[PDB]
Amino acid sequence: ATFEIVNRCSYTVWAAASKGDAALDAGGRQLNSGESWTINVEPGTNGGKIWARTDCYFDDSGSGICKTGDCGGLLRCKRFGRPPTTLAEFSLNQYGKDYIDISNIKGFNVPMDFSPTTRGCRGVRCAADIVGQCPAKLKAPGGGCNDACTVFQTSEYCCTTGKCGPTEYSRFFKRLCPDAFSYVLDKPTTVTCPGSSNYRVTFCPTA
């Protein structure tokens, strides 16, 4: 499956793509304002994620650091990134279908649209200004808006026991971005697509 990843932000981002224990394609790349990077993801990829990293410095060997989304200091990511990170999430070819969603469960850093480029389903979008409206106790000094689990580490926020409900913090994400997961047991906003669909992930989809 192809994913075109497009940076429409006015700033540079470093795109990242991973399934948790391995890179997807090259795993990571700089995208200046306006650039596009097309990657190929193996069919049957389960639990893949794509995200943006901000304010990064890499040396010539591709080691360094990012203020948001850092995946162990590597340009070419092999594992998931450090919150806060808006996430495009997908599982491909799962009994005939593809499954996509956007999640705020690990916070928000960059607005995003995640849309198929082939027929037969809708896209999802989380483009509101969550960073600027963030509640004081969630603001990440390094940039972005943390989820409550990352800040407070309690069973209720992390949904450790499988029994959590909505909270004042998860309701902030849900009010700004109704179409993204705001906590673990949120009412699903996953979109079912035809198996083997192709996709575009756009950072900063709106003006």
UniProtKB/Swiss-Prot annotation:
Disulfide bonds join 9-204, 56-66, 71-77, 121-193, 126-177, 134-145, 149-158, 159-164. This is Thaumatin I. It is found in: Cytoplasmic vesicle. InterPro entries: Osmotin/thaumatin-like_sf (IPR037176), Thaumatin (IPR001938), Thaumatin_CS (IPR017949). Coiled coil: none annotated. SMART domains: THN. Taste-modifying protein; intensely sweet-tasting. It is 100000 times sweeter than sucrose on a molar basis. The lineage of its organism: Eukaryota, Viridiplantae, Streptophyta, Embryophyta, Tracheophyta. SUPFAM superfamilies: Osmotin, thaumatin-like protein. The keyword Signal applies. The keyword Iron does not apply. Transmembrane segments: none annotated. Keywords: Cytoplasmic vesicle, Disulfide bond, Signal, Taste-modifying protein. Belongs to the thaumatin family. Its main location: cytoplasm. PROSITE patterns: THAUMATIN_1, THAUMATIN_2. One of its GO terms (cellular component) is cytoplasmic vesicle.
